[PDB]
Swiss-Prot record, chain A:
Its biological purpose: Subunit of the fusion protein that is processed upon entry into the host cell. Mediates fusion of the virion and cellular membranes by functioning as a class I viral fusion protein. Contains a viral fusion peptide that is unmasked after S2 cleavage. This cleavage can occur at the cell membrane by host TMPRSS2 or during endocytosis by host CSTL. In either case, this triggers an extensive and irreversible conformational change that leads to fusion of the viral envelope with the cellular cytoplasmic membrane, releasing viral genomic RNA into the host cell cytoplasm.
Species assigned in the record: Severe acute respiratory syndrome coronavirus 2 (2019-nCoV)
Protein name: Spike protein S2'
Superkingdom classification of source: Viruses
Amino acid sequence: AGAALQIPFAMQMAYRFNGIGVTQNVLYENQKLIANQFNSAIGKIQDSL
Amino acid sequence: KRVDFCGKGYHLMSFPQSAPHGVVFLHVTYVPAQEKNFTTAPAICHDGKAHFPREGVFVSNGTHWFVTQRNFYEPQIITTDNTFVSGNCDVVIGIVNNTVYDPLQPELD
Ligand SMILES: *[C@@H]1O[C@H](CO)[C@@H](O[C@@H]2O[C@H](CO)[C@@H](O)[C@H](O)[C@H]2NC(C)=O)[C@H](O)[C@H]1NC(C)=O
Ligand SMILES: *[C@@H]1O[C@H](CO)[C@@H](O[C@@H]2O[C@H](CO)[C@@H](O)[C@H](O)[C@H]2NC(C)=O)[C@H](O)[C@H]1NC(C)=O
Ligand SMILES: *[C@@H]1O[C@H](CO)[C@@H](O[C@@H]2O[C@H](CO)[C@@H](O)[C@H](O)[C@H]2NC(C)=O)[C@H](O)[C@H]1NC(C)=O
Ligand SMILES: *[C@@H]1O[C@H](CO)[C@@H](O[C@@H]2O[C@H](CO)[C@@H](O)[C@H](O)[C@H]2NC(C)=O)[C@H](O)[C@H]1NC(C)=O
Ligand SMILES: *[C@@H]1O[C@H](CO)[C@@H](O)[C@H](O)[C@H]1NC(C)=O
């Protein structure tokens, strides 16, 4: 939408949780589990491929 | 709100014009400009409680902390009407110490 403006990635993930109706404390208080789940989900794609 | 469906930027409004066998759309959009960098933090710890912005981000100009809206820089001081509380400050990665100002009790002298 213009020039790239940097933001830390967990804070971008919190904006995106807001965009679906969940408060952002739910992301910050679960950060490690959410990242573990994303990593297992990405590791399952290359296994199916 | 569909990205790039009505031009580049944040769609404000669009005007139609007729062409021969066709149509022309003049899209008016909003494009952000002249950014500055800041230090930032996800929450703020005060009295053993974690505070999150209601809307906006916590930013630091070098020595002081403010809340701003995310798309236009307009800094304000962090109060209990700017933020909400959840939990204690032991669980959030990158939490920062600052004071969150209450209006009522300095009204009550
Ligand atoms: C929410 O669901 C997750 C499942 O992804 C739970 O986390 C797992 O809990 C089991 C316990 O049976 C552990 O063995 C796993 O190692 C956990 N997974 C990860 C990625 O940490 C989590 O406990 C659930 N939360 C609640 C409150 O029920
Ligand atoms: C960050 O902004 C603050 C403004 O709040 C500057 O601090 C001073 O703060 C006092 C009381 O809050 C004001 O009376 C002053 O007018 C403010 N400015 C000055 C120049 O004294 C602070 O200087 C700013 N810091 C940086 C690094 O820009
Ligand atoms: C951002 O990354 C920096 C590393 O570049 C982290 O700084 C380190 O913090 C640890 C404490 O967890 C210290 O032991 C290291 O000495 C620091 N390294 C440097 C180079 O400063 C910083 O903590 C990270 N920020 C967050 C919020 O995790
Ligand atoms: C932010 O403020 C809290 C509140 O005091 C600090 O917590 C103290 O941390 C030190 C060192 O980690 C401990 O020795 C104290 O026992 C803690 N106090 C309490 C009341 O728990 C915290 O360290 C501060 N954060 C930073 C980065 O300085
Ligand atoms: C912000 O700082 C970075 C270096 O950390 C620099 O590359 C960038 O151009 C700066 N942008 C602005 C708007 O100051």
